[PDB]
Structure formats: structure tokens, C-alpha cells
């Protein structure tokens, strides 16, 4: 019911510069584009692999902790 995605090599990753609690907080593309943060200032990277999507971690986001799929 929640995301829990582990990033794969080459996978696009997004952080909301406005809402992230700190610079380690990130979303997969599915969760980013299904969240409020698609209309905010963001930082996109291409993943080296490993790490995980923070969708649903209510302590990672100051607003919009979930996307529309996982709410």
C-alpha cells in the first residue's frame, strides 16, 4: 500500500527543495509526479542505484508526505 521502492541504476530521483526536511529526502518518479511537489522547486538526479523512495515518511516532508497512489 506504500511505495518502498529501492532505486535502480539510472532511475530518475527527485527531491522537493521547498518541502524536504533535509537534503537526503527523495522520491521516485511515480511518487514525485503524483504528489503536490510536481508544482514546487525540485532537484532531479539520475540514481547511481540503491537508496529508497521516502513517500509516506511523514517525518521526511514538511507538506505532502504521500503521493496520490500511496495516500
Amino acid at each position: 500500500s506504500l511505495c518502498g521502492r529501492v532505486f535502480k541504476v539510472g532511475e530518475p530521483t527527485y527531491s522537493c527543495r521547498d518541502c524536504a526536511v533535509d537534503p537526503t529526502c527523495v522520491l521516485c518518479m511515480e511518487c514525485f509526479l503524483g504528489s503536490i511537489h510536481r508544482d514546487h522547486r525540485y532537484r532531479m538526479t539520475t540514481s547511481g542505484g540503491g537508496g529508497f523512495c521516502d513517500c509516506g515518511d511523514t517525518e521526511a516532508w514538511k507538506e505532502g508526505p504521500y503521493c496520490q497512489k500511496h495516500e
Partner: peptide
Amino acid sequence: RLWS
């Protein structure tokens, strides 16, 4: 979180 990002892996680093």
C-alpha cells in the same frame, strides 16, 4: 533516503 539517498544512498551515500
